[PDB]
PDB file of C-alpha atoms and ligand atoms in Angstrom:
ATOM      1  CA  UNK A  69       0.128  -0.279  -0.154  1.00  0.00           C
ATOM      2  CA  UNK A  70       3.258   2.392   0.106  1.00  0.00           C
ATOM      3  CA  UNK A  71       2.392   2.624  -3.697  1.00  0.00           C
ATOM      4  CA  UNK A  72      -1.126   3.734  -3.289  1.00  0.00           C
ATOM      5  CA  UNK A  73      -2.451   6.787  -3.915  1.00  0.00           C
ATOM      6  CA  UNK A  74      -5.875   7.242  -1.078  1.00  0.00           C
ATOM      7  CA  UNK A  75      -7.892   9.783  -2.852  1.00  0.00           C
ATOM      8  CA  UNK A  76     -10.828  12.189  -1.573  1.00  0.00           C
ATOM      9  CA  UNK A  77     -13.347  14.261  -3.245  1.00  0.00           C
ATOM     10  CA  UNK A  78     -11.317  17.411  -2.355  1.00  0.00           C
ATOM     11  CA  UNK A  79      -7.636  15.709  -3.718  1.00  0.00           C
ATOM     12  CA  UNK A  80      -9.915  14.501  -6.568  1.00  0.00           C
ATOM     13  CA  UNK A  81      -9.084  17.632  -8.902  1.00  0.00           C
ATOM     14  CA  UNK A  82      -5.549  17.841  -8.160  1.00  0.00           C
ATOM     15  CA  UNK A  83      -4.059  14.660  -8.006  1.00  0.00           C
ATOM     16  CA  UNK A  84      -6.347  13.345 -10.949  1.00  0.00           C
ATOM     17  CA  UNK A  85      -7.779  15.577 -13.485  1.00  0.00           C
ATOM     18  CA  UNK A  86      -4.221  18.257 -13.133  1.00  0.00           C
ATOM     19  CA  UNK A  87      -2.268  15.215 -12.661  1.00  0.00           C
ATOM     20  CA  UNK A  88       0.408  14.837 -14.822  1.00  0.00           C
ATOM     21  CA  UNK A  89       0.233  11.268 -16.752  1.00  0.00           C
ATOM     22  CA  UNK A  90      -1.737   8.394 -16.558  1.00  0.00           C
ATOM     23  CA  UNK A  91      -3.677   7.847 -13.728  1.00  0.00           C
ATOM     24  CA  UNK A  92      -5.415   4.668 -12.884  1.00  0.00           C
ATOM     25  CA  UNK A  93      -7.984   4.971 -10.486  1.00  0.00           C
ATOM     26  CA  UNK A  94     -10.152   1.897  -8.671  1.00  0.00           C
ATOM     27  CA  UNK A  95     -13.460   3.253  -6.889  1.00  0.00           C
ATOM     28  CA  UNK A  96     -14.462   0.951  -4.337  1.00  0.00           C
ATOM     29  CA  UNK A  97     -15.881  -0.093  -1.238  1.00  0.00           C
ATOM     30  CA  UNK A  98     -16.034  -1.660   2.099  1.00  0.00           C
ATOM     31  CA  UNK A  99     -18.113  -4.345   1.932  1.00  0.00           C
ATOM     32  CA  UNK A 100     -17.421  -5.311  -1.718  1.00  0.00           C
ATOM     33  CA  UNK A 101     -15.621  -8.623  -1.994  1.00  0.00           C
ATOM     34  CA  UNK A 102     -14.563  -8.046  -4.983  1.00  0.00           C
ATOM     35  CA  UNK A 103     -12.670  -4.937  -4.570  1.00  0.00           C
ATOM     36  CA  UNK A 104     -10.766  -6.308  -1.555  1.00  0.00           C
ATOM     37  CA  UNK A 105      -9.078  -9.586  -3.662  1.00  0.00           C
ATOM     38  CA  UNK A 106      -8.303  -6.625  -6.559  1.00  0.00           C
ATOM     39  CA  UNK A 107      -6.782  -4.868  -3.722  1.00  0.00           C
ATOM     40  CA  UNK A 108      -3.091  -6.990  -3.756  1.00  0.00           C
ATOM     41  CA  UNK A 109      -2.769  -6.842  -7.624  1.00  0.00           C
ATOM     42  CA  UNK A 110      -2.863  -3.126  -7.181  1.00  0.00           C
ATOM     43  CA  UNK A 111      -0.273  -3.216  -5.426  1.00  0.00           C
ATOM     44  CA  UNK A 112       1.712  -5.532  -7.676  1.00  0.00           C
ATOM     45  CA  UNK A 113       1.146  -3.181 -10.616  1.00  0.00           C
ATOM     46  CA  UNK A 114       1.571  -0.031  -8.777  1.00  0.00           C
ATOM     47  CA  UNK A 115       5.305  -1.849  -8.524  1.00  0.00           C
ATOM     48  CA  UNK A 116       5.737  -2.496 -11.521  1.00  0.00           C
ATOM     49  CA  UNK A 117       4.393   0.598 -13.364  1.00  0.00           C
ATOM     50  CA  UNK A 118       6.157   3.440 -11.532  1.00  0.00           C
ATOM     51  CA  UNK A 119       7.278   6.501 -13.151  1.00  0.00           C
ATOM     52  CA  UNK A 120       4.521   5.205 -15.706  1.00  0.00           C
ATOM     53  CA  UNK A 121       1.796   5.241 -13.650  1.00  0.00           C
ATOM     54  CA  UNK A 122      -0.302   6.493 -10.599  1.00  0.00           C
ATOM     55  CA  UNK A 123      -2.405   3.580  -9.132  1.00  0.00           C
ATOM     56  CA  UNK A 124      -5.065   5.341  -6.845  1.00  0.00           C
ATOM     57  CA  UNK A 125      -8.217   4.288  -4.577  1.00  0.00           C
ATOM     58  CA  UNK A 126     -11.325   6.066  -3.863  1.00  0.00           C
ATOM     59  CA  UNK A 127     -14.001   4.819  -1.486  1.00  0.00           C
ATOM     60  CA  UNK A 128     -17.339   6.251  -2.573  1.00  0.00           C
ATOM     61  CA  UNK A 129     -18.630   5.092   0.907  1.00  0.00           C
ATOM     62  CA  UNK A 130     -16.914   7.758   2.049  1.00  0.00           C
ATOM     63  CA  UNK A 131     -17.054  10.245  -0.499  1.00  0.00           C
ATOM     64  CA  UNK A 132     -19.507  10.218  -2.649  1.00  0.00           C
ATOM     65  CA  UNK A 133     -19.597  12.554  -4.520  1.00  0.00           C
ATOM     66  CA  UNK A 134     -17.273  11.366  -6.963  1.00  0.00           C
ATOM     67  CA  UNK A 135     -18.513   7.906  -8.763  1.00  0.00           C
ATOM     68  CA  UNK A 136     -21.993   9.950 -10.341  1.00  0.00           C
ATOM     69  CA  UNK A 137     -20.085  12.190 -11.964  1.00  0.00           C
ATOM     70  CA  UNK A 138     -18.286   9.425 -14.018  1.00  0.00           C
ATOM     71  CA  UNK A 139     -21.244   7.588 -14.471  1.00  0.00           C
ATOM     72  CA  UNK A 140     -20.367   5.113 -11.957  1.00  0.00           C
ATOM     73  CA  UNK A 141     -23.078   1.891 -11.809  1.00  0.00           C
ATOM     74  CA  UNK A 142     -20.884  -0.982 -10.318  1.00  0.00           C
ATOM     75  CA  UNK A 143     -17.738  -2.105  -7.994  1.00  0.00           C
ATOM     76  CA  UNK A 144     -15.234  -1.951  -8.302  1.00  0.00           C
ATOM     77  CA  UNK A 145     -14.718   0.049 -11.485  1.00  0.00           C
ATOM     78  CA  UNK A 146     -10.880   1.421 -12.793  1.00  0.00           C
ATOM     79  CA  UNK A 147     -10.625   4.159 -14.563  1.00  0.00           C
ATOM     80  CA  UNK A 148      -7.723   5.584 -16.247  1.00  0.00           C
ATOM     81  CA  UNK A 149      -7.220   9.164 -16.778  1.00  0.00           C
ATOM     82  CA  UNK A 150      -4.947  10.952 -18.937  1.00  0.00           C
ATOM     83  CA  UNK A 151      -4.763  14.675 -19.376  1.00  0.00           C
ATOM     84  CA  UNK A 152      -8.167  15.283 -16.934  1.00  0.00           C
ATOM     85  CA  UNK A 153     -10.118  13.183 -19.673  1.00  0.00           C
ATOM     86  CA  UNK A 154     -10.951   9.558 -19.092  1.00  0.00           C
ATOM     87  CA  UNK A 155      -9.324   7.215 -21.696  1.00  0.00           C
ATOM     88  CA  UNK A 156     -10.690   3.924 -20.714  1.00  0.00           C
ATOM     89  CA  UNK A 157     -12.569   1.943 -18.068  1.00  0.00           C
ATOM     90  CA  UNK A 158     -13.492  -1.689 -17.379  1.00  0.00           C
ATOM     91  CA  UNK A 159     -16.047  -2.814 -14.830  1.00  0.00           C
ATOM     92  CA  UNK A 160     -15.362  -5.463 -12.510  1.00  0.00           C
ATOM     93  CA  UNK A 161     -12.635  -7.418 -10.746  1.00  0.00           C
ATOM     94  CA  UNK A 162      -9.910  -9.135 -13.266  1.00  0.00           C
ATOM     95  CA  UNK A 163      -6.336 -11.237 -12.644  1.00  0.00           C
ATOM     96  CA  UNK A 164      -3.069  -9.518 -12.640  1.00  0.00           C
ATOM     97  CA  UNK A 165      -2.105 -10.312 -15.942  1.00  0.00           C
ATOM     98  CA  UNK A 166      -5.333  -8.496 -17.714  1.00  0.00           C
ATOM     99  CA  UNK A 167      -5.012  -5.355 -15.329  1.00  0.00           C
ATOM    100  CA  UNK A 168      -1.527  -5.453 -17.061  1.00  0.00           C
ATOM    101  CA  UNK A 169      -3.061  -6.191 -21.138  1.00  0.00           C
ATOM    102  CA  UNK A 170      -5.012  -3.648 -20.374  1.00  0.00           C
ATOM    103  CA  UNK A 171      -3.042  -0.623 -19.277  1.00  0.00           C
ATOM    104  CA  UNK A 172      -0.120  -2.386 -21.944  1.00  0.00           C
ATOM    105  CA  UNK A 173      -3.138  -1.512 -24.757  1.00  0.00           C
ATOM    106  CA  UNK A 174      -3.994   2.047 -23.427  1.00  0.00           C
ATOM    107  CA  UNK A 175      -0.370   2.897 -22.095  1.00  0.00           C
ATOM    108  CA  UNK A 176       1.458   5.448 -24.538  1.00  0.00           C
TER     109      UNK A 176
HETATM  110 CU1   CU B 144       3.061  -1.498  -0.241  1.00  0.00          CU
END
């Protein structure tokens, strides 16, 4: 978790929208089992994509206003931002091999 960024509705603008470089955001919740299952995968990817990517999480339970703006229908949902615009999205849990493929298809 040392390579993951914790966002708040507040910090969203700065840390994601104004952010320079690719930002992968994990919209999740407390009592979502699938959310808990990808947490470790998110750790590894983070470590492997340092310099190229910033991995960040958003607990919609404690940050209820961001999701809606993005059409978030269910969790976990992963949003890949670029230059303040969402570049790609993935709904639901996936493996590390999957997450990798998904980024690679988007990483410049
Ligand atoms: Cu860590």
